[PDB]
Design a protein around this nucleic acid. Structure first.
Lengths: 172, 172
RNA sequence: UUUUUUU
RNA sequence: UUUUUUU
């Protein structure tokens, strides 16, 4: 959703205004060259004064990520604790893998079986030609435990299938 | 409210303009290095000429406080009397205390009882884990008579509770 | 109660 | 479970 665009920042200075918070972060983002396009990343920032925390709202997912390098930064005597929201979890194509070099003959279930070995998948799609309808020789997938991704890359990449050499790498 | 952002300045020079007042204070704030962020602290200043006083409006709570060191400053032959507004009183988390090292077993009423001893509280919260729901081992509170704060720190800090050493200090 | 306390 | 995780 939009949780990949918000950040929790705790241990905020007492009585700091929401605007002062915004100005500080947009400025840090600019001074570091961390923005992806022209204009300010931080759109808004809501403060829960008693609970001593604020949430930063960003315009983009990547900039939300980039700002995390500011964890611990000193601002008005307080060292800021920047964290992702609790409802947060990586977006659907976050660790999606590209698997090419597949023999044209294998079908979904067959291809999936070769991947499933390293663990259960959360998403998968084998590209088939519009008219023809058979495999185009490559597919995309993604495991549930996003940590098994690298283990799967190592094990599957380069593997010999038919007269083809498999190619596995993150699709992004 | 916004009373932690205004200041009463009495004994102002006769016929002084509101703008001259503003320029004088923003300049003092800059010459002393008393500002927290770029830009002028003093946003506005209203003068009640007959009553011989003006109020300064600041952009931040801390800068409002910082300017008070200018009490008695000579300006156009008159020694300025800087004071907080009368409606003023410290903001909700002003003297909030952090209390850590609490045994996970104690509950709100139990924890509160250990604090209440030094006087009545105006605010209190014991942090409990989102799912689990039990104490995370630390709480925040604040007494009504904000003077008992130090007396409570001395008495409670370091106290032995279970197999833990209590830690009490202002939460800011 | 020896310089005036307001949105 | 030693600084408080929300649209």
């Amino acid at each position: 959703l939009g949780s990949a665009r918000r950040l929790y920042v705790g241990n905020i200075p007492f009585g700091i205004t929401e605007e002062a918070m915004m100005d500080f972060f947009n400025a840090q983002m600019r001074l570091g060259g961390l923005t992806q396009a022209p204009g300010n990343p931080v759109l808004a920032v809501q403060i829960n004064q008693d609970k001593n925390f604020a949430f930063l709202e960003f315009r983009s997912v990547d900039e939300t990520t980039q700002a995390m390098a500011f964890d611990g930064i000193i601002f008005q005597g307080q060292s800021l604790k920047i964290r992702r929201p609790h409802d947060y979890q990586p977006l659907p194509g976050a660790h999606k893998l590209f698997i090419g070099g597949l023999p044209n003959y294998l079908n979904d279930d067959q291809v999936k079986e070769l991947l499933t070995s390293f663990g259960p998948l959360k998403a998968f799609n084998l590209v088939k030609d519009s008219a023809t309808g058979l495999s185009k020789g490559y597919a995309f997938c993604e495991y549930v435990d996003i940590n098994v991704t690298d283990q799967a890359i190592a094990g599957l990449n380069g593997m010999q299938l038919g007269d083809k050499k498999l190619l596995v790498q993150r699709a992004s």
